[PDB]
């Protein structure tokens, strides 16, 4: 999840001319072109065609000026095209200028200039400056790709939101990697580091620094086994044993054999 930004900085149509060779509204007069800009974003093309759908998204500006201008809480000279898919890095950018004419009709003949640029851009880079010269107009503009908050990587598809609750305990680093908080481990940082010395063959923990023993083991580090209940002069090696000392017998090692 991310967005593509284009910042228009300059545009010149000295003659007040459209691409078809007519005046917008001796020179071309004084009723100037009422200029606005469209941005088409589509797949990368070896040969860039004017036709084709904007399969990556599109945008437009309001009318910004007459024949020539620079720019300069909503910026009219900035086109933002959000996207959900993974950013493919390579792309075709088509930028068109238009005269608006106060007519509910879609008159295509009102096109001023069309420029294009096939290339590669990553979110890591910042504003790339692009200069264009057509038969009519000269454009100057910057472009940028940014990931939304908690999205990372060159595709803007790697997700990481910090979390400290029922499902995990971690922050995020520069590149979207989970950094487990003090006392947690595992790929999703939901697995706790038990206190040190805890034999984890027979121990476990829900909370960092804890170690409770499996059935049949005991002790602080859960490294000591549980003798058969009632065992007197006997000891344990594996749980539930009662191995007698010398001259002692019985199930509980309580019978004097001397
Ligand atoms: C369009 O121009 C103005 C708005 O800019 C409007 O008042 C006028 O009626 C319109 N003219 C037409 C449709 O010829
Ligand atoms: Ca016109
Ligand atoms: Ca005009
Ligand atoms: Ca016009």
Numbering used by the authors: 27 to 51, 60 to 106, 124 to 309
Copied sentences from the primary study:
Here, we present the first structures of Jagged2 (N‐EGF2 and N‐EGF3), which has only 58% sequence identity with human Jagged1 (N‐EGF3), together with the longest known structure of a Delta‐like4 ligand (human Delta‐like4 N‐EGF3). Two crystal forms of Jagged2 (N‐EGF2) (green) and one crystal form of Jagged2 (N‐EGF3) (dark green) were solved, including a total of seven crystallographically independent copies of N‐EGF2, and 1 copy of N‐EGF3 (N.b. not all of EGF3 is visible in the electron density). All of these copies have been superposed on each other by alignment of the DSL domain, showing some flexibility in the hinge region between the C2 and DSL domains, and further flexibility in the hinge regions between the EGF domains. The Jagged1 and Jagged2 C2 domains bind calcium ions (shown in red), whereas Delta‐like4 and Delta‐like1 do not; the aspartates involved in calcium binding are not conserved in Delta‐like4 and Delta‐like1. The C2 loops are ordered upon calcium binding in both Jagged1 (Chillakuri et al, 2013) and Jagged2 and contain the amino acid ligands for calcium binding although the number of calcium ions bound differs. Interestingly, the three calcium ions bound in the Jagged2 C2 domain are at equivalent positions to three of the five calcium ions bound in the Perforin C2 domain (Yagi et al, 2015). The α(1,6)‐linked fucose on the Asn‐153 N‐glycosylation site in Jagged2 packs against Trp‐151 side chain (shown).
